[PDB]
Design a binder for this molecule. Structure first.
Ligand SMILES: Cc1cccc(Nc2ccccc2C(=O)O)c1C
Lengths: 337, 35
């Protein structure tokens, strides 16, 4: 699994860098696993160059890891993330909304249902507005209310929508005491400008380090089971050079170097959210044939009647004294080929 | 004698699941009160 999750991490970071070019000096927040899961699922029904491009854009090399190993790895990944863990809520699922008149291969349907937990819905896309609400409501429900209004616009000729959703809720191993939270503390948003945020404060032992190559502080806060948060705080003006270095190799290094010790720690209490139109981004990164009129999804429908048209992601984060709640959803839209 | 860590300017955040080594969420907080 780890060689997969290492490739998935480098995809995360490469995509993160594309975002710092598209929306620079702005909040970024996404679920790399949601985006990867959705695209891998889209690849399950693709063939030939259409399938190849998707998984290569995801960062896999078909010599090192053949298509079947990739498919089997992602099935074991989703299954593992969903396995019941005490004191941690984590669920990642997906749903395929299929046009009433499409001819889906009952092979592909039975296999996504049994192997990726996929929920399948016959959708009347001739009521494009009602369909949009149904999907949005399904995603809202499955992200425990946190991801509202995923799909803003849905093309009139949509005949399939694939959604992936992730919800995460967990308690800090060491929760903050709200009576020690400072109501109004300064946070630097640029050289000369501050905003006011609640600043949580605790004195405890944490795994942390100062990366002496990259000139940033890394702080790890564990959740009470099976999960952690890493905070990466560059020295002033060093954020670009930390961003350029982020990689699976860097994460492996920090995993080795992180040491537990006492820290006087101040962390902001806050919420953010971000949305991404991913259509063009994915084309650039190498997913080309999936959008063309010669798209090959012969594994999906009898008549290979569709092509990808649009893709979008929405993610939200809340951090407070008790822990973290985060959610995300990925949206892939198909129209007639 | 203890180091002070103050998350009081722009930072990157990662949320990782341990057993699979998955990055569940990835981001940068430039302005935590934005929008
Ligand atoms: C490369 C990689 C990708 C995803 C998760 C992990 N795990 C960590 C990385 C850095 C710090 C801590 C961890 C951990 O899970 O303990 C790694 C090493």
């Amino acid at each position: 699994l780890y060689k997969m999750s290492s490739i998935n991490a480098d995809f995360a970071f490469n995509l993160y860098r594309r975002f710092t070019v598209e929306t620079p000096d702005k909040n970024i927040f996404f679920s790399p696993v949601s985006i990867s899961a959705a695209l891998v699922m889209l690849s399950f029904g693709a063939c030939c160059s259409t399938q190849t491009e998707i998984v290569e854009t995801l960062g896999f090399n078909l010599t090192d890891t053949p298509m079947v190993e990739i498919q089997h790895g992602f099935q074991h990944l989703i299954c593992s993330l969903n396995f019941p863990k005490k004191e941690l809520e984590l669920q990642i699922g997906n749903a395929l909304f299929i046009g009433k008149h499409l001819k889906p291969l009952a092979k592909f349907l039975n296999d996504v249902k049994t192997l990726y937990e996929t929920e399948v819905f016959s959708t009347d896309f001739s009521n494009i507005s009602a369909a949009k609400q149904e999907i949005n409501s399904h995603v809202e429900m499955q992200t425990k209310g946190k991801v509202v209004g995923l799909i803003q616009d849905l093309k009139p000729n949509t005949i399939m929508v694939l959604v992936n959703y992730i919800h995460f809720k967990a308690q800090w191993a060491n929760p903050f005491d709200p009576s020690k939270t400072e109501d109004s503390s300064s946070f630097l948003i640029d050289k000369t400008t501050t905003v006011q945020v609640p600043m949580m404060h605790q004195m405890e032992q944490y795994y942390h380090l100062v990366d002496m190559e990259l000139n940033c502080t890394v702080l790890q806060m564990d959740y009470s089971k099976n999960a952690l948060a890493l905070f990466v705080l560059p020295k002033e003006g060093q954020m670009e050079s930390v961003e350029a270095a982020m990689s699976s190799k860097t994460l492996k290094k920090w995993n080795r170097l992180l040491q537990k010790g006492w820290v006087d720690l101040f962390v902001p209490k806050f919420s953010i959210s971000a949305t991404y139109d991913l259509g063009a981004t994915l084309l650039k990164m190498g997913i080309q044939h999936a959008y063309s009129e010669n798209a090959d999804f012969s594994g999906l429908t009898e008549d290979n009647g569709l092509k990808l048209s649009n893709a979008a992601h929405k993610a939200v984060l809340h951090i407070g004294e008790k822990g973290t709640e985060a959610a995300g959803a990925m949206f892939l839209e198909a129209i007639p080929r | 004698l203890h180091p002070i860590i103050q998350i009081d300017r722009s930072f990157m955040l990662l949320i990782l699941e341990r057993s699979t080594r998955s990055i569940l969420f990835l981001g940068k907080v430039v302005n935590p009160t934005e929008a």
